[PDB]
């Protein structure tokens, strides 16, 4: 509190955190959903070199 | 206790440990001593291409 506000990425620093599942690498947030919409892979209807 | 003794390097596993100095990489044990003996660097007494 007795300093200027130091804004550095090497200032914002925490200890090691334990996530659910006892992993310590921070898990990737995204997981592809299982809703009514699937992954609409477009595929070229190919004539030459099939 | 109700298992066979499982001896694997992936069995011997601990959590994250905090060392003195608030480091978490396990520090190297060796530090060269400051006794009465210094590091006796041998150096070739060189004649050609000095």
Short mmCIF file of C-alpha atoms in Angstrom, two decimals:
data_model
loop_
_atom_site.label_atom_id
_atom_site.label_comp_id
_atom_site.label_asym_id
_atom_site.label_seq_id
_atom_site.Cartn_x
_atom_site.Cartn_y
_atom_site.Cartn_z
CA UNK A 1 0.00 0.00 0.00
CA UNK A 2 2.96 2.34 0.59
CA UNK A 3 4.29 2.05 -2.98
CA UNK A 4 3.16 3.29 -6.40
CA UNK A 5 0.85 0.87 -8.24
CA UNK A 6 3.25 -1.51 -9.97
CA UNK A 7 1.57 -2.96 -13.08
CA UNK A 8 3.75 -5.74 -14.47
CA UNK A 9 3.05 -9.29 -15.56
CA UNK A 10 5.85 -10.34 -13.21
CA UNK A 11 3.94 -8.61 -10.41
CA UNK A 12 0.67 -10.51 -10.90
CA UNK A 13 1.84 -13.82 -9.49
CA UNK A 14 0.22 -16.50 -7.35
CA UNK A 15 1.34 -19.70 -5.69
CA UNK A 16 0.66 -23.15 -7.09
CA UNK A 17 -3.04 -23.94 -7.33
CA UNK A 18 -4.65 -27.38 -7.17
CA UNK A 19 -7.61 -27.87 -9.51
CA UNK A 20 -10.34 -30.53 -9.33
CA UNK A 21 -9.04 -33.94 -10.28
CA UNK A 22 -5.75 -33.20 -8.46
CA UNK A 23 -4.17 -31.80 -11.61
CA UNK A 24 -1.87 -28.81 -11.44
CA UNK A 25 -1.52 -27.82 -15.06
CA UNK A 26 -4.36 -25.32 -15.58
CA UNK A 27 -6.96 -27.14 -17.66
CA UNK A 28 -8.12 -25.93 -21.02
CA UNK A 29 -11.49 -24.26 -20.64
CA UNK A 30 -13.05 -25.27 -23.95
CA UNK A 31 -14.85 -28.59 -24.42
CA UNK A 32 -16.88 -29.08 -27.60
CA UNK A 33 -20.59 -29.20 -26.72
CA UNK A 34 -22.90 -32.18 -27.02
CA UNK A 35 -26.01 -30.23 -28.00
CA UNK A 36 -28.33 -30.99 -30.88
CA UNK A 37 -25.87 -29.39 -33.30
CA UNK A 38 -22.95 -31.60 -34.39
CA UNK A 39 -19.75 -30.50 -36.10
CA UNK A 40 -20.83 -29.82 -39.68
CA UNK A 41 -17.74 -30.96 -41.57
CA UNK A 42 -17.94 -29.69 -45.11
CA UNK A 43 -16.35 -32.11 -47.55
CA UNK A 44 -15.70 -31.40 -51.25
CA UNK A 45 -17.67 -33.71 -53.52
CA UNK A 46 -14.64 -34.71 -55.52
CA UNK A 47 -14.46 -35.91 -59.13
CA UNK A 48 -10.77 -36.08 -60.06
CA UNK A 49 -8.35 -37.96 -57.74
CA UNK A 50 -10.88 -39.47 -55.37
CA UNK B 1 -1.95 -51.64 2.62
CA UNK B 2 -4.37 -54.06 0.93
CA UNK B 3 -2.41 -54.22 -2.35
CA UNK B 4 0.90 -55.75 -3.45
CA UNK B 5 3.89 -53.42 -3.05
CA UNK B 6 3.86 -51.36 -6.24
CA UNK B 7 7.40 -50.16 -7.01
CA UNK B 8 7.25 -47.66 -9.87
CA UNK B 9 8.71 -44.22 -10.37
CA UNK B 10 5.18 -43.08 -11.22
CA UNK B 11 4.11 -44.39 -7.81
CA UNK B 12 6.62 -42.39 -5.77
CA UNK B 13 4.96 -39.02 -6.17
CA UNK B 14 4.44 -36.04 -3.87
CA UNK B 15 2.60 -32.75 -4.06
CA UNK B 16 4.28 -29.43 -4.77
CA UNK B 17 6.82 -28.48 -2.12
CA UNK B 18 7.87 -24.95 -1.13
CA UNK B 19 11.56 -24.55 -0.33
CA UNK B 20 13.26 -21.74 1.62
CA UNK B 21 13.35 -18.53 -0.34
CA UNK B 22 9.84 -19.25 -1.71
CA UNK B 23 11.24 -21.06 -4.73
CA UNK B 24 9.52 -24.13 -6.09
CA UNK B 25 12.08 -25.51 -8.50
CA UNK B 26 14.14 -27.90 -6.34
CA UNK B 27 17.47 -26.17 -5.80
CA UNK B 28 20.76 -27.66 -6.84
CA UNK B 29 22.49 -29.09 -3.80
CA UNK B 30 26.09 -28.35 -4.74
CA UNK B 31 27.74 -25.02 -3.99
CA UNK B 32 31.51 -24.75 -4.42
CA UNK B 33 33.15 -24.34 -1.00
CA UNK B 34 34.97 -21.29 0.28
CA UNK B 35 37.58 -23.16 2.32
CA UNK B 36 41.31 -22.58 2.25
CA UNK B 37 41.58 -24.56 -0.98
CA UNK B 38 40.72 -22.63 -4.17
CA UNK B 39 39.99 -24.08 -7.60
CA UNK B 40 43.42 -25.07 -8.90
CA UNK B 41 43.02 -24.31 -12.59
CA UNK B 42 45.84 -25.93 -14.49
CA UNK B 43 46.87 -23.86 -17.50
CA UNK B 44 49.31 -24.99 -20.22
CA UNK B 45 52.43 -22.83 -20.33
CA UNK B 46 52.13 -22.21 -24.03
CA UNK B 47 54.89 -21.41 -26.53
CA UNK B 48 53.31 -21.53 -30.00
CA UNK B 49 50.09 -19.56 -30.65
CA UNK B 50 49.90 -17.67 -27.38
#
